[model samples]
Target chain A: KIEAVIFDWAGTTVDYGCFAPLEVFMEIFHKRGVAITAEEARKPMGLLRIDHVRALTEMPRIASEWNRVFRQLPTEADIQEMYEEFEEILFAILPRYASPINGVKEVIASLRERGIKIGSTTGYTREMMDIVAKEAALQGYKPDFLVTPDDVPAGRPYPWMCYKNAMELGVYPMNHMIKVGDTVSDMKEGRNAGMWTVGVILGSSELGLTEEEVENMDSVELREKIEVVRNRFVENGAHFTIETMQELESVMEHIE
Target chain B: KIEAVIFDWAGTTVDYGCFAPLEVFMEIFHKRGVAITAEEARKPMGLLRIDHVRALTEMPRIASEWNRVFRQLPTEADIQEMYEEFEEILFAILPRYASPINGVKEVIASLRERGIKIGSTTGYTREMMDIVAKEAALQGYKPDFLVTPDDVPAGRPYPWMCYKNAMELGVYPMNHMIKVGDTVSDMKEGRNAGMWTVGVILGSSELGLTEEEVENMDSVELREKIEVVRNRFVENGAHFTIETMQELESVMEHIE
Candidate 1:
């Protein structure tokens, strides 16, 4: 008798490899002379892309690194300047990654049949996921509610977006709702909001593997790759993990 | 961590694709010239198997079917004969339904790792689920406790079975417990026990689809079908519903 399912954008729902956010964050930071690695950039995944910059800057190490390279740590205004350009690069590339992930449209279909309201929480801005919102609807993944930082004060690892989704969906008591994503910030947001949390392994930012890439890997290698993401989500205290959005339906099936 | 999780058999756990009970019930009635829809057979599913037969026969519409077919109303003795045949048919093919629902074995493994105890309740008797419980374990699903009508005075819509799980698994107050199933009766059973209820979609007896069958349907059509089952679960007072057992751990995570 589960009432609702709350999905993360990009990795958990679309963007097969969850490469969109990380790729842009790296590019923008690189332009500003902050040479951040993929792993470091990924640390704040699932937060609002703007908040993501803040999180990275708040990291003492990344702060010192930025100070050494740019003559000072990135001030809030500096990050805003960074975000302004991120919009230009993102708007150009967003259309390409707008296609829903392999099994996501089908997953949404299955969820709808069960009459469970589908709500969404994303680290994306309305300007960005507006591309996603329109693109996904054509592919048939429009949700009952699509919440963003524009709708809330903060994003992932913060409960506001989740709370907003819950408020809109009317899924109260929190426990009856589930928050699903593919990043640590998503999981933390889920747990922080007092809802059930499920991290995804494949097509996830945590693992950073596309469906095709995973398919091509040897069986053992596939398992090992997925395990890396699985272990990270598990270690971060996500309530659980599903290997793919494809598995999301199956996971929902055995609940009762 | 989840305090304890109680499961229902047939559509919820074993019988992955969810046809064993309905197909047979349809066939049994088919032999008697009383044609029944799958939906009709799904409604009274939480009773013990033997009781299930009696419940069906006693339904006004079904009773009318029996009266028209046999030139008289079905009596307790007539149903006893039906029960005899039903038992033969059930045991003969129940093994084919013994595999754990698609994601259940793995879902259980994840739960066990979190130190959550797994317990079970079912419309099946101990005699019915023994093969299921044993075979599922071979595939790596073995619950800490399994209770049936053999151990309780009645089946679903009654709290005894859930109560038995709570007693054996050392969980109390029921508030911390979760009971998941693929039927409205299971939800009623859970509600009666004051445990959180989660109805599973798709492969549920309520939805009545094999994994592949559901896979092949158009997203809109599939969702329409699942919605019918979902609404029934919600209207009957289920606390919530999940698309699959794969979501079990997510539900477990949010419970207090």
Candidate 2:
């Protein structure tokens, strides 16, 4: 039987109100005298923040447009000022912008009651965790163990955190572990760690990732971006893929 | 005037002694009945953990080695089991293994005293930050802000977090901002945001990054990783680049 189930934060367990990053970015960019459309910001929703900046600034068209708007080349300070400005908007808007996925708390609680240890992995740092933890507690959700990228040698797509969680839980025979996440990286992480991997379509599709983008992501990119996660599990011979927690219930019954 | 600065965590402000990871992975692989050498683990040091796990599982040579060590392919549970065991060793060893970079705290405090804000950005989520924050505080270093991957739409290479910080600090005029980090990705983030970008040779180079690997890095990756960042700033119209924080005292005098 699957003795433990791990859930990824963000879109999987929580609804981040559709990656409206452009709303924040445009406000910050405007302060710097740079004009950016919301459509542009949404193009790279799942990328790392640094990479997103690179994508935005690397565009020749955008650079020239920014120059026209600002009448001068932006300096490093300008960017920092703009970014700092964006944070305020994010925190203020977050409560209105994000919420937990339906039934998540119930599933977690049920699993806990069944004596199946629960673990949660997230990409958020402690500061963000402070916000999320408080919210989760208010909603009556708690995992047996919580892991973040810093805790492991590698982040998602890397199985270190999952591995760490399993070890800390003292659960032997990793086949008893299950990992559920919304992003491809999370799924890859589960696969890499040799855990049963499940991918939820809800959040990713909402992020506006194109079908081409999703299909092109394939296993290699998944490993690179998420860490050796998905490909590793496939190589190790894991083939189960599921869409929802409801599906997980059936998988659990079958496996047990 | 710029009132604060932010640094990226991981390869930037702290040294997560390299040996711990290599030794831990070596042991994990061994327990999985895979005979991987410490040398193998070193080959892909900067990779996220999931990617690292995949590397060990997928490489034909490595897989064969693993097969030679064990008669059967490792199940998902086996990988998870090995990883968990490794984490136990890491939690015990990490505290003793890490060392902060020289002058990092001094620079932050110095900037803070000047009423310049200081912040930090990291890919590590909350759980990991607990350890790092405690350690940093113990070392008498504390930033005005600490941003994790979950704080913004993206992690490094994206200017979102930096922008978030700048906005939250209520700092105006982006040109006055500066970002110092060790990775090519960090350089790119600063450059993308029009902030002064500084690259440190000590930490990034010590990780044994290759010229090609360094070249493909965000900062042009052509010259040495350090030089690539230096040139990227120049090409992208950055204020300047320096080799170490010790130079910052003099560099800031000239720039400020």
Candidate 3:
């Protein structure tokens, strides 16, 4: 039985679409003369956004293109400048994205009822998450423990943030815990943490469509999209993939 | 009577001539193709050595000359590298310089006997001072309390180290304390700390002579040298200057 359920925020628990960060990342680099794709911004979504900027700078193709545009190496000053700007734009929109997805509160309540501790890991720094957390709490979806990249050596896919959550929640025997999220970085985070990892197919950036986009799509095409996203997370070594949070109760029952 | 006396390490305490770091600072920059004078190395003497390197880097003439040599601004990483090498060179020669200067033990003992606390502040980080402190203690000249730049937010002329000494040693009323050292930074530190500042003339780096050079000087020349150095300290705000630690008792009586 799972002793704790660790979650990713935004796309997985709140903000049915994780569009909060895409514009910030896109805008910062665009100001610096590099046009970053939303997918490139999302690629490092589970890392601290400052670290995300560094990761974006290191991508071989991106680095060469940036040099072609800016004509030099990015210094620490450049990183600081970009991060300060990122904070300004991201903070403006983060609270509006704190609304819990349809099934999140119900799933969390069920998990709490079963004595499974609710833990969380996030790419957001404490400062960036203050308003978002207050708003999420108002919507009845607060975790027992929350770990952030700022609170650990490194963020997701490095395991420290998730391990910190497990440690603070007093959860034991890594395999007996679950890490559920929606992105490839989240899958890698769970695997590196040595816990059972689950990927949620709906309301995830992996599906790469907004809530309204999905609602208007044909059922057959939506099923096709689910198959593709499921294949991506599972292929990347997630232990399980559920079509939505609505199906998590059955998955937990089967695992137990 | 004075409640406590604080001293800077190096020329103010052990390492009579303050030569240990001068050569280290000179050597590290020279190896990196930048030749630094003993004066530049000595000017920032009462700051933490890492900060001393930073001071050298910030010096209008020195930093420009260094950038001319190294072809780039000295980053923190550059400072860290230079300081690592600095530690290696400093550690190699520090033990031999740890013996207390003449009359230091007697003065420390006299103050201890009369309920006066012996506190110290230093440019050295604790790690760099570890061997020096042990060796000085072995030589029968340990302070009642010691503080390093590492122990506070800022060092030397910034005054936090002295305030920390006051807090830690339970010494009070800044005027009832004396800060004694052999550098201008020490004078500035004492002045900022609101304590009576005494500059040591003989066997001091301000006089800048080897022990043998000082000993072999003509008696009249020595007296003239003392006048010049003493005047500088007084002009720089030191309340008093003594020829040696042997003269400290009379000064303490004057302050009390």
Candidate 4:
């Protein structure tokens, strides 16, 4: 039996399609007169905010844009400045996106009924997470334990956050734990932590579509987008994938 | 290639035979009018100080002894009191045992020359480690990174300390990291962290003998004792065992 299921905060459990921080990333780059696509911003979605800024600086296309706009690539100081700006922007928007994704509450309850503990890890710093966690709790979706990037030495895809969650939840022998998230880094983090990983598609940062976008899109187009995201998760070492949080029970059963 | 080696502080690197904390453990129990054998105290040697006390309290013999002496089983309050006492006692005597074990300096230098980062984890809390680390550094033995139980949510046989070390050292893909220590919890911690584990026998807590005792003992008896410790480590999932710190170079070569 799975001892615990560790979920990622945004995209996986809340902030459907992970729009909360996407705008902040774009706005920070736009403020610098360098345009970064949403895909570029989302590529490092599950990393620590500072690391995410640094990662964007290293991307070839973004690096060239930065070099052209500033006459040089982004420096450590620039990345730090951008990270602080990103943090401020995201913190302001985080509370508004704290509601649980569709069907997540029922999924969490189902897991709890079967004696599994719930844990969560986040790319947000403790300060950013406090707002999100409090708001999410108000909406009845607080996890048994919450670990943020600030809680550990580092964040995904380093596995420190996942390990922190396991320690806090008192779950062990990682095979009995499940990591459910909506990004590639989440899969890598879980794999590094030696736990089974499940990827969620509809509410994923990888899919990059709002709930309304998903519901209104042509069925064939949505299916194709999901396949692309699912394949990326698989390539990044996700053990399973589900189109929705409601399907997690069947996936856990298959794992058992 | 092995990118990093995470060492345990006591018998595996310094304080030969793990005598530093062993005495404190026995002394605390002795002061309470319950005598615990050295073997019993050493059984939980590589766990966090508080966890060590809790583990001892759970031992059948120790529980019965406490029941007979106090007419009741130990409670959480008793464990906390004993843990505080253990901390005070260990803190006082920790400095005297801070010298590096024989051949460890050379072994560390060799690993460094080959570009392997040295990281360490311990059962001691951060406060306790500050003493040991400062003393060890003055004695010309210092790891690049040090993680105590206080640095993580818990300690061995959980993988949190090792994971913290890896994060601090910036090492990845656990197989390229090695955990070298003198206790079963060390072996278990490494296995749980998905790293290769090497157990040291000669100056190990499992052998329960000082350097002089090991050297002066009958060769046959020493061999028998070493075999017992070796078997215990192997049974607990140590990937390799060495008779001395000097042999670590060869083991790393074999792993490479």
Show how many residue pairs clash in every candidate, following the order shown. Answer: 24, 61, 0, 0
**Candidate 4 colliding pairs:** none
- How much TM-score does chain B earn in each model? 0.78, 0.74, 0.79, 0.80
Looking at model 3, residue B88 earns an lDDT score of: 81
In model 1, the runs with Cα more than 4 Å from the true position are A1-256, B26-83
| Cα error of candidate 3 at position B119, Å | 37
Q: What is the interface RMSD of each candidate, in Å?
A: 14.6, 18.1, 21.5, 2.3
Q: lDDT per model, in order?
A: 0.76, 0.63, 0.81, 0.84
List the candidate numbers ranked by lDDT, top first: 4, 3, 1, 2
On residues A133-225, what C-alpha lDDT tens digit does candidate 1 reach at each position?
887778767889887877644445566666566545655556777888878888787776666788887777768665676778899988887
Model 4 segments more than 4 A misplaced: A21-96, A125-127, A152-155, B21-94, B125-128
Best by lDDT: 4
Q: Return the top candidate by TM-score.
A: 4
Give the Å shift of residue A54 in candidate 2: 52
lDDT of 3 by residue, A1-256 (tens): 6788888998899888688888788888888777678778767844366898888887878888878887887778888889889878888888878899888899888878978898888877889778889999998888998878887555565766765665467554567788899889899878765678999988998888888888898999989989999999988978889977988878888888
User: On residues B121-217, what C-alpha lDDT tens digit does candidate 2 reach at each position?
Assistant: 8766776677777776787666787778776555666566665666556553445677877655677777655566776654553444532444456
Which candidate has the top score in DockQ?
A: 4
Better of 2 and 4 by lDDT: 4
TM-scores, one per candidate = 0.43, 0.43, 0.43, 0.74
